[PDB]
Design a protein around this ligand. Structure first.
Ligand SMILES: CC(C)(C)OC(=O)N[C@@H](Cc1ccccc1)[C@H](O)CN[C@@H](Cc1ccccc1)C(=O)N[C@@H](CCC(=O)O)C(=O)N[C@@H](Cc1ccccc1)C(N)=O
Lengths: 99, 99
């Protein structure tokens, strides 16, 4: 699809069996999702953004379907206001910026 | 261009004669920059990211050049670790997310 940016680029994602909404963010190196129970062992880590650092639980090799397209990669879980799909996953659906 | 996301989408931006680099951020509503010592009045405001909130100064009608594309828009100046071209300016250059 071609998504114009007049409004926030929110798309449907399916993770851990549930449908959620997530923001396609080209400015995020990583994927950060709101609190949720995920399978497997996690590692504590810290990522930084505009207002500083937050603590996150890192899950590796998690499968996610972004608008029907399957991807598998690291997912960081923590106190984020909203789900952010980052470059680590965007590259897997062949997502590109065009102008 | 059609830009892939294997590395941060950094581009050249010219503003007030000064050349700089900024991140094409589809996850940012606004364009946020380091101090650009811009002339004119501004309005203080708060914006947030991952990690908390920051205080910025809002400057409207700023002539800015992005990849040879000339646009005019609101620039928010403040303590951001990196320059961000948000959707307010990404739309002005006809930028879309595609996959
Ligand atoms: C998620 C990780 C992996 C940590 O990456 C970044 O945060 N990368 C940031 C760039 C950066 C790199 C290095 C250092 C510093 C900054 C992007 O801006 C991330 N894009 C979104 C992520 C996001 C979206 C939604 C909620 C939380 C976080 C963002 O910060 N967007 C801000 C950018 C600033 C701006 O546009 O004004 C935004 O849209 N803020 C809105 C929406 C908002 C409001 C309240 C709270 C949170 C967000 C606002 N009006 O303040």
């Amino acid at each position: 699809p071609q998504i114009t940016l007049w409004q926030r680029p929110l798309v449907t994602i399916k993770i851990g069996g549930q449908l959620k909404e997530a923001l396609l963010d080209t400015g995020a190196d990583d994927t950060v999702l709101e609190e949720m129970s995920l399978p497997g062992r996690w590692k504590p880590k810290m990522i930084g953004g505009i207002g500083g650092f937050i603590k996150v639980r890192q899950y590796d090799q998690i499968p996610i379907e972004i608008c029907g397209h399957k991807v598998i990669g690291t997912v960081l879980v923590g106190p984020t206001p909203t789900n952010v799909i980052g470059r680590n996953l965007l590259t897997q659906i062949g997502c590109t910026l065009n102008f």
